[PDB]
Amino acid sequence: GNPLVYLDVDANGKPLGRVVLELKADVVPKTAENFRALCTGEKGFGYKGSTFHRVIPSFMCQAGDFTNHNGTGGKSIYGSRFPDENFTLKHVGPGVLSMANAGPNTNGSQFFICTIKTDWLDGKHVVFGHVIEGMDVVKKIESFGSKSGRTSKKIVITDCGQLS
Ligand SMILES: CCOC(=O)c1cnc2cc(=O)[nH]n2c1C
């Protein structure tokens, strides 16, 4: 079946809890596999210890830059970037998991979790899963963002991996 993965998240060094994500490998296998392996760290790099560096209330929480920790970096398990697999899944509401990018076919490791429907990203960002459990953690993260995206607490993925 589709992978279930987890992110355990701290804010200012204290645990907020766990976000569980379903990865829609049935729709976007290459994109799901990238995220799954970055969660386990099995290629020798991944999300463990990295941050939510850009968080905008009433929009989304972005993370996954495990190389530069600021939005300029990250890399996929395939190489630095990989193509947009498809745009079939849509940004339908809070809890959608989608790939950040800097234009067509620039997926790396950065991702975002929506806290609202973000329909204008349909056809531009590859949606590849959604929150199964832990929206409360997502709302805490969101509450530490700002209009500019700068966070007001240090939000760290302390642990991550695959549940199934
Ligand atoms: C994977 C591509 O990531 C981005 O394009 C990106 C990453 N981080 C930030 C912080 C910010 O304020 N803007 N920002 C952007 C546009």
* CA 55 from centroid of its chain's CA atoms: 11
> What's the one-letter identity of residue 80?
S
Give the Cα separation of 70 and 140 in Å (integer): 20
Q: What is the largest CA-CA distance in the chain?
A: 38
Query: Measured from the CA of 106, which atom of ligand 1 is nearest?
Result: 1
Q: Which of 7, 21, 97, 121 is catalytic?
A: 121
CA of 5 to the centre of ligand 1 (A): 23
Q: For domain 4-162, give the fold.
A: Cyclophilin (2.40.100)
* 48 close to 158: Cβ distance less than 8 angstroms: yes
Q: Is 34 a catalytic residue?
A: no
Tell me if 51 CB under 6 Å of ligand 1: no
Is 68 assigned a catalytic role? no
14 CB-near residues (< 8 Å, 6+ apart): none
> What is the residue type of 40?
T
Percentages helix, strand, coil for the chain, rounded to the nearest 5?
A: 15, 30, 55
List the end-to-end C-alpha distance of the chain, in Å, as a whole number: 8
Domain boundary assignment for the chain: 4-162
Any idea of the CA torsion for 120, 130, 125, 82, to the nearest 10 degrees? 180
Residues with Cβ within 8 Å of 69's Cβ and at least 6 positions away in sequence, in order, are 50, 51, 53
Sequence-ordered list of residues with C-beta below 8 angstroms from that of 125, at least 6 positions apart, any chain: 87, 91, 98, 99, 100, 101, 112
Judge contact between 112 and 60, C-beta under 8 A: yes
Long-range Cβ contact pairs of 145-148 (< 8 A, separation 24 or more): 145/54, 145/55, 145/56, 145/57, 145/61, 146/55, 146/56, 146/57, 147/56, 147/57
**125, 128, 130, 144: which is the annotated catalytic residue?**
125
CB 110 within 8 A of CB 65: yes
Torsion sign across C-alpha atoms 87, 38, 63, 79 = negative
